[PDB]
Design a protein around this ligand. Structure first.
Ligand code: I1E
Ligand code: I1E
Ligand code: K
Ligand code: K
Ligand code: K
Ligand code: K
Lengths: 447, 452
């Protein structure tokens, strides 16, 4: 099949030794830098057509992070790839002890549709840096970006080492029968199970970046003008379609109306009276997701928004009040511009609420009390945490990005990408010289 | 069921918060140190009955490494558990950025039979240190150690947090239906697939310490006296039943006879003329495995040994020469005191030989040439590597132990155990004050574009 042949060529190219010299890997990363620069308009056009992004947010909410990653990895690659001496003991003073990093082989990156450039190429950057061949499967739901990458990736990168696999669910299923040395998947919790099950057939390690409802706790006595502007920004970017969007708010009932008012104020600053006319507001990816998100508004109290246009997949920025935690909008990851407010009567109740649910990819808290922040972190578990902001923690080179429990396993970004896509091999090198300190180990044992 | 209740109690005890303070973790670890001290004779007795171990090798080839791990983790725990500040950026200079470590919850450790104390308890030590409840499933093949641990673990450790699950494969299958937050499994490549598949149903991360044939390349130009003594020691300890035993030798045909000779020389110093009479030589674990290992001698050219005793499951230390790489003894992990010598014409043929097979848990090479060592490491892949010795690389606090490919995924020992059994959670904590610098990110975006 075309899939088998593509994987076979990538494997043969890897086994030839082509990717081992750092110079080769840097040449490929520099080719990706050129692709991003030369194809800027085409990348913007694809993201506009798929998700209703514009020239500015295509770059500053997505493409720029890929560039930052490439530049950082080129800079640090020689240091990261070096053999790493480790601590000795008195019995190992004459020995060499070190960690050797080496590629895994052929890595599969399965992209997702909501940041279809970042969530295909930023993982690929790390896997190239670690000296692997990298097969890419873009998501079919972001059709324009999938077609674009199929054209431009082989225009810039080694055609055998870094193939793009076209198609949808059937093609992904076929692809998952091939033997890889690592799979990174971004997407849903339920499909993550399917990936890990396919991986098990070949004992392939996985990085799974999955889902959940990222809670956003807002403390009673904090600056709500600042908090709500930050929350609105991260909730409503990409029309709510972000893995670490603050999915819902937990707050004391006494501040619910203040939160509604300040969210509305910020939404109007950001997108105007009619968000459908804002160049900065996105659209839902597909008809199925549009219907799904609209359905989550049914039965709810709408404090703002609550309308949509099916033809162009616009959903007005929507705020829901006094939400029942058992209702549909509180029983699945929203992935859309619908923000429910659930009342809780204390920090302790908020912590209980979070802990009774599955572990989220992100947990957020807004408070000017550092003790509240530390308590909530200490007593909960989530992939990552931001206090007094949203989103930003997954963009930093020094903070590995990943989930826990149903939000996933493993992590990447920066140095962690290099480690994730390498095997770190423990090495002991001894002199081949008779040693008297060793003789105690050999039989016969002493009485 | 008994299984469902044990897991339910462990989960509830974890949820009570009792494992979170370091004081409690250290107490439990100190309870294991007491167990090892107070139960010294009972442990030797179990290993003697299971594997024909004695008081010396029970300790220095197994139990001591658990003790060293406990002592090391107790001393380092506060540092390891501390929030870990990370590098800032100009944009985050006024924020706090750090990695927060926290337990995963309930960890399952599935033991194996060949080092049935170390390969049950050493993983447990790490999982305890990271603040988890830990359910243990010992291997039934080491029956005496399995029954001893079910008795003594609850005598020393918290009863609800650290239960022992009895039984064989049916019970392990039932146990694997329960929901854990991590599973560590030591055993076979085949069964690792089954474990990872069961784990997927709850998105449970796995550490799989699996198998393969660890090759041992011997350079023409090296000191064969020193080399072969080291090889013999690693190969024949525990009657060959070690995950990182040097499984087979690759050598130039011009040195095969010298290798046979020096191996024989060391075997006689170790165990005498008749290894059946040595208190230091083990026995095969089970009838099933005795029959399997003996089958691997069939149709082979025997240079030394080659006989066994079904009644005592003794297999004489056996060396095979000019072995066909396609023959049974070269097509499965031996896990027995049968050492095939496979001929190669060069280092380059050895590298290709190794690369055409599945990635082994350990790779060994004997050579006084630095360039030979560097090149073999550069051009192959294995869990870990030792040059000029065997076994010892998995006994050091600073060298994580684990496989790659069919030999496994993940690793543990020392700090790596703490990391493996924790979730490492990235945290950004910003001040909640107006920051002019953030306003760039808010819509509306600028209506004109500028250079990037
Ligand atoms: C899941 C990660 C994600 O959606 C993302 C990527 C890049 C920038 C922001 C968010
Ligand atoms: C697989 C690990 C193993 O058999 C071992 C443990 C401790 C010492 C030697 C070998
Ligand atoms: K309501
Ligand atoms: K001795
Ligand atoms: K630390
Ligand atoms: K602005």
């Amino acid at each position: 099949s075309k899939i088998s042949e593509a994987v076979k060529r990538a494997r043969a190219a890897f086994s030839s030794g082509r990717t081992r010299p750092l110079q080769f890997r840097i040449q490929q990363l520099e080719a990706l830098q050129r692709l991003i620069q030369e194809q800027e308009q085409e990348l913007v056009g694809a993201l506009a057509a798929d998700l209703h992004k514009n020239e500015w947010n295509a770059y500053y909410e997505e493409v720029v992070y890929v560039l930052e990653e490439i530049e950082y990895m080129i800079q640090k690659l020689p240091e990261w790839a070096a053999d790493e001496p480790v601590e000795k003991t008195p019995q190992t003073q004459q020995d060499e002890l070190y960690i050797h990093s080496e590629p895994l082989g052929v890595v599969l990156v399965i992209g997702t549709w909501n940041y279809p450039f970042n969530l295909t190429i930023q993982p690929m950057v790390g896997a190239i840096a670690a000296g692997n061949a990298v097969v890419l499967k873009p998501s079919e739901l972001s059709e324009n970006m999938a077609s674009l990458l199929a054209t431009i990736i082989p225009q810039y990168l080694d055609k055998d080492l870094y193939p793009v696999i076209n198609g949808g669910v059937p093609e992904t299923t076929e692809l998952l029968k091939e033997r890889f040395d690592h799979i990174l998947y971004t997407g849903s919790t339920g499909v993550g199970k399917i990936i890990m099950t396919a991986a098990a057939k070949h004992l392939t390690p996985v990085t799974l970046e999955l889902g959940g409802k990222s809670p956003c706790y807002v403390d009673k006595n904090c600056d709500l003008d600042v908090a709500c502007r930050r929350i609105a920004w991260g909730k409503f970017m990409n029309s709510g379609q972000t893995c670490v969007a603050p999915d819902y708010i937990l707050c004391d009932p006494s501040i619910q109306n203040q939160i509604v008012e300040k969210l509305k104020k910020s939404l109007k600053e950001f997108y105007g009276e009619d968000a459908k006319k804002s160049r900065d507001y996105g659209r839902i990816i597909s008809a199925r997701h549009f219907q799904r998100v609209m359905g989550l508004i049914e039965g709810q109290k709408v404090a703002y928004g609550g309308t949509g246009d099916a033809a162009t997949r616009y959903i007005a920025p929507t705020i829901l009040t006094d939400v029942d935690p058992q209702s549909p909008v509180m029983q699945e990851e929203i992935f859309g511009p619908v923000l429910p407010i659930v009342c809780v009567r204390s920090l302790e109740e908020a912590i209980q609420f979070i802990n009774q649910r599955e572990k989220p990819l992100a947990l957020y808290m807004f408070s000017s009390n550092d003790k509240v922040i530390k308590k909530m972190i200490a007593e909960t578990s989530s992939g990552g945490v931001a206090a007094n902001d949203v989103i930003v923690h997954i963009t930093l080179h020094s903070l590995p990005f990943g989930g826990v429990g149903n939000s996933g396993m493993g992590s990447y970004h920066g140095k962690k990408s290099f480690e994730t896509f390498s095997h770190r091999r423990s090495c002991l090198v001894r002199p081949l010289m008779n040693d008297e300190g060793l003789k105690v180990r050999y039989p016969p044992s002493p009485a």
